[PDB]
Each structure stands twice: as C-alpha cells, then as structure tokens.
Enzyme design. Structure first.
Site, PDB file in Angstrom:
ATOM      1  CD  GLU A  73      56.126  58.454  56.261  1.00  0.00           C
ATOM      2  OE1 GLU A  73      57.321  58.073  56.143  1.00  0.00           O
ATOM      3  OE2 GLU A  73      55.132  57.676  56.522  1.00  0.00           O
ATOM      4  CE  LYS A 130      61.834  62.296  43.945  1.00  0.00           C
ATOM      5  NZ  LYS A 130      61.604  61.774  45.313  1.00  0.00           N
ATOM      6  CE  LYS A 160      59.859  66.711  46.475  1.00  0.00           C
ATOM      7  NZ  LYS A 160      60.187  65.413  47.130  1.00  0.00           N
TER       8      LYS A 160
HETATM    9  C1  LIG Z   1      53.852  57.807  53.467  1.00  0.00           C
HETATM   10  C2  LIG Z   1      54.800  58.234  52.368  1.00  0.00           C
HETATM   11  C3  LIG Z   1      55.781  59.169  52.599  1.00  0.00           C
HETATM   12  C4  LIG Z   1      56.602  59.628  51.560  1.00  0.00           C
HETATM   13  N1  LIG Z   1      57.490  60.643  51.809  1.00  0.00           N
HETATM   14  C5  LIG Z   1      58.135  61.150  50.761  1.00  0.00           C
HETATM   15  C6  LIG Z   1      58.887  62.315  50.955  1.00  0.00           C
HETATM   16  O1  LIG Z   1      58.997  62.806  52.081  1.00  0.00           O
HETATM   17  N2  LIG Z   1      59.591  62.817  49.876  1.00  0.00           N
HETATM   18  C7  LIG Z   1      59.518  62.233  48.615  1.00  0.00           C
HETATM   19  O2  LIG Z   1      60.163  62.742  47.687  1.00  0.00           O
HETATM   20  N3  LIG Z   1      58.717  61.140  48.390  1.00  0.00           N
HETATM   21  C8  LIG Z   1      58.071  60.636  49.417  1.00  0.00           C
HETATM   22  N4  LIG Z   1      57.309  59.507  49.240  1.00  0.00           N
HETATM   23  C9  LIG Z   1      57.185  58.959  47.869  1.00  0.00           C
HETATM   24  C10 LIG Z   1      57.770  57.535  47.754  1.00  0.00           C
HETATM   25  O3  LIG Z   1      59.198  57.489  47.571  1.00  0.00           O
HETATM   26  C11 LIG Z   1      57.059  56.785  46.615  1.00  0.00           C
HETATM   27  O4  LIG Z   1      55.654  56.633  46.950  1.00  0.00           O
HETATM   28  C12 LIG Z   1      57.705  55.444  46.270  1.00  0.00           C
HETATM   29  O5  LIG Z   1      59.089  55.602  45.935  1.00  0.00           O
HETATM   30  C13 LIG Z   1      56.973  54.727  45.164  1.00  0.00           C
HETATM   31  O6  LIG Z   1      56.956  55.526  43.974  1.00  0.00           O
HETATM   32  P1  LIG Z   1      55.547  56.103  43.412  1.00  0.00           P
HETATM   33  O7  LIG Z   1      54.970  56.923  44.567  1.00  0.00           O
HETATM   34  O8  LIG Z   1      55.940  57.012  42.245  1.00  0.00           O
HETATM   35  O9  LIG Z   1      54.721  54.898  42.942  1.00  0.00           O
HETATM   36  C14 LIG Z   1      56.507  59.026  50.283  1.00  0.00           C
HETATM   37  C15 LIG Z   1      55.581  57.991  50.111  1.00  0.00           C
HETATM   38  C16 LIG Z   1      54.699  57.660  51.093  1.00  0.00           C
HETATM   39  C17 LIG Z   1      53.695  56.582  50.827  1.00  0.00           C
END
Ligand SMILES: Cc1cc2nc3c(=O)[nH]c(=O)nc-3n(C[C@H](O)[C@H](O)[C@H](O)COP(=O)(O)O)c2cc1C
Ligand SMILES: Cc1cc2nc3c(=O)[nH]c(=O)nc-3n(C[C@H](O)[C@H](O)[C@H](O)COP(=O)(O)O)c2cc1C
Lengths: 216, 216
Positions: A164, A13, A73
């Site tokens: 995303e 984050k 970020k």
């Molecule tokens: C394709 C994709 C888009 C994501 N978009 C965001 C985003 O825009 N902002 C964010 O804070 N996290 C984003 N995430 C992080 C997800 O919330 C996170 O992958 C999920 O909660 C699982 O936690 P981890 O990534 O710590 O294992 C995204 C994850 C993926 C796979």
C-alpha cells in the site's frame, strides 16, 4: 498442504533481480488475477503486469521520494502487478459481464439471463444510489482478489509482497487511469527473495484466536 | 497444483447438511483466518465460526427480507464464518499488535520494536485523521482475508460460498457486535455441496484478459 503454504509464506523485503518467473509462471499469475471470485461476478478491476525493466520503472515512479523502500522492491522483482478498481460501475460493464456469462454457457434460457442481469443491476444500483459506497464496494472486490493472489503465488513457490506504500495519484497519472475509469490500490511485486530479505527468516506473528475468533 | 484449485473452485449454491468438516479441517479453516496478511499486520478483524445448529440459526436470521436465498446456504453448511471488521482503529489495538510481534520474537532490539510501532501508528493516523477512511481501510483487509480464505478452503478440498447477501444490521444486533466495536461484512458457509448445487456443474465465466489486463 495449503496450510503449510499459509504458515510459510511471507512478505518479501528484497528480491533477487536475476531470478525471473518461468514463461509458465508468468501465465499462471495472470490466470490467478483473472479467476478470482467477486460479488455478482462484477470483476470490477484492471491489472497492470509490469515485466520489463522499463515497465517496472514506470510503476516505481509512484514510490519515488516518499516511499523509497517500496521503490526497490518494485524494481528487483520479476513481475510487478498493479491492482486497480473501477471508479464507477457503468451499465456497459454490467452488460459486458452478463454477456460473457451468456457466451460461456451459464444461462439455460433468455429468462435466466435477464433475471441475472436484473439482480446484478439491483445490487449495483443499491451501492451507488442508496449506500453511496460503490467505489468502496468495488475496491473491496479488488482486495479480495489480492488475498487470492498472495496465497496463489505462494503456492506456486513464488515470493511476493503486497504494497500500500506507494502514491496512487502518481501511479494513476503515469498510466492515465483516471480518464479510463480506474484507480490503483495495491502493488504486488512477484519473484524470488534475495539474501537481503531479512523477513524470510523471521517468525510469523499473528494475534491469538482467543482474541480474534468466537465459536458458536 | 493451486491453478487447478483456482479454476475448479466455485460458489456453492446448495450444501449437503449431513457432510461435516473433519475435526482437523475445522482447525485448518481457523488457521487460514488467523494467518491471512494485512496492512501493517493490523489484523483488524473478528471472526464468528458457527458450527452448531443454534449458532447457524442465529447467523441465518440475517437472511431475511431480500436475502432469503442465503438462508439455506447458511443453515445447511457444516461451518459458517462471519468476517467482521473493526469499526474504528484504536491505539490499544495497535499496541496489542506490536506487543504480539515482540512476543513472537520479531524484534532484535527495543529500537526495532519502537520503529515498527511508530510506522504502524503513522499509517493508522493517515487513515483515521487525514483520509478519514479507517473504516474502509480495515474492511479492505477483511476482504483480503476472505480471498485468501476461499482459495485455501478450496485447496483443502472443501466447498464454500462468499455471501454479501445478508442483513448486516440484523447480524450485528444478533451478536452484539456494534458495542464490541465490529461489524459483519461477509458470511462464508463452508462444507460440501449437494447434488442440488446447480453451480457445481456450470461453466465458470470471467472477462477476457484483453479487457482486464495490460502487460508493460
Ligand atoms: C494490503 C497490504 C498492504 C501492505 N503494504 C505493505 C507495504 O507497503 N510495505 C511493506 O513492507 N509491507 C506491506 N505489507 C506487508 C505486511 O506488513 C504483512 O502482510 C504483515 O506484516 C504480515 O506478515 P506476512 O505478510 O509476512 O504474513 C502490506 C500488507 C497488505 C496486506
Ligand atoms: C464478496 C462476494 C459476495 C458474494 N455474495 C454472494 C451472495 O450473496 N450470494 C451468492 O449466491 N453468491 C454470492 N457471491 C458469489 C459470486 O456470484 C461468485 O463469486 C461469482 O459469480 C464467480 O463465480 P465462482 O465463485 O463460482 O468462481 C459472492 C461473491 C463474492 C466474492
């Protein structure tokens, strides 16, 4: 091992802007992007790797206004990767791919090469002409690349977050992507997290396998 | 060294049916499927892991018609994973996800939980109500999972091949997936390659970064 990596990695984050990838690392992240697999080795992608403050600033324009949390970020991280998919699969790309496979020595004979070309053309034509899903097909391959990349960069001991939450129309226009035949899908800031990364210390949550997984 | 892993892994063309995953490996691959990231932690996926002769034969009904070259890969590997996406995103799934994050202890307060839920719902609504692309959005997350998986299993020292060359209609019907709210996207046999795997000894081929990658 790699399971430790999978269980320990997280979506960062907040990044510490003073921590920069080593030169080695900066090369390795490019190696990861390049060497992902894809259907038919179609490699239907373009990457923008922003490592300058001004490069990162250009990417971060895509988050300004509506995606303000994504903005920081993108600016704090050492390297920011924009994953783009082709918007159309042209005969020129198909030929480029097979000719590289040829150059790399994958075909014993001219017949093997032409069979490979024909098979790839058939697959591509099906997506375009019949399923009408070629844009989606190619985007799926970019997402596979992303999955590859997040595990790879975690295994290098780097922090990252897939995003995303950006405006693809703004990013596309910032880099003239539409006219070049690409569109931006996912932004991945890569670096080292700061003490403001509250997600670094939270437990990971996933649904239980008895919901998501059947053994036969 | 994850870069070595990425550069040495390949799509296996022929598996040695006598070489099975260790029991521990069989559990690790399940961990890799479960712990992939996804947008909003939406986890919009179902996995079928076929490890029996009968189970693998059921999956291999999907290698009919144009896809007969997939049949042996699906039968001779030790474990065969079918990656499925949800066909629609429902509020029940959204609640399931946030309640699990709550149970795992991700939320300090009721407000934190409700904020997380509302953010997830906004993202989901944008896909299913504005863009009308929730099926594609969820499939893209499954493909991300696939890319994580292929690198993970390579890092475990296992062989695999991702397959789009199967008949999804047949595989869906064989397992009753449509009525359960899923559809099959990618089949990934996992095991150990045989000496007939001609792809094990061929050079890997990718496009050059001067085509695929811009530094800014
Ligand atoms: C394709 C994709 C888009 C994501 N978009 C965001 C985003 O825009 N902002 C964010 O804070 N996290 C984003 N995430 C992080 C997800 O919330 C996170 O992958 C999920 O909660 C699982 O936690 P981890 O990534 O710590 O294992 C995204 C994850 C993926 C796979
Ligand atoms: C989504 C996906 C679908 C694929 N489908 C098949 C398939 O049906 N049959 C096959 O033999 N290989 C299949 N491949 C293997 C690709 O041809 C391979 O990934 C690509 O040629 C790169 O070589 P490598 O995986 O050995 O690095 C698939 C790859 C991906 C990523």
């Amino acid at each position: 091992d790699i399971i430790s990596v999978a269980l320990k990695r997280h979506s960062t984050k907040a990044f510490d802007a003073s921590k920069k990838l080593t030169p080695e690392q900066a090369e390795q992240i490019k190696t990861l992007l390049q060497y992902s697999p894809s259907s038919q080795n179609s490699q239907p992608w373009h990457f923008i790797v922003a490592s300058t403050e001004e490069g990162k600033a250009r990417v971060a324009k895509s988050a300004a206004g509506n995606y303000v949390f994504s903005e920081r970020k993108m600016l704090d991280a050492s390297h920011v990767v924009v994953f783009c998919a082709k918007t159309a699969m042209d005969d020129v790309w198909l030929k480029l791919v097979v000719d590289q496979e040829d150059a790399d020595g994958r075909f014993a004979t001219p017949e093997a090469k032409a069979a490979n070309d024909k098979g790839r053309k058939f697959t591509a034509d099906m997506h375009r002409k019949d399923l009408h899903d070629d844009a989606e097909w190619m985007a799926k391959q970019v997402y596979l690349n992303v999955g590859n990349f997040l595990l790879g960069v975690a295994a290098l001991g780097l922090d990252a977050v897939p995003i995303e939450g950006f405006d693809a129309a703004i990013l596309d226009a910032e880099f003239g992507l539409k006219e070049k035949g690409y569109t931006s899908l996912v932004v991945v800031p890569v670096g080292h997290h700061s003490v403001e990364d509250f997600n670094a210390t939270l437990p990971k949550s996933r649904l239980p396998q008895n919901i998501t997984l059947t053994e036969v």
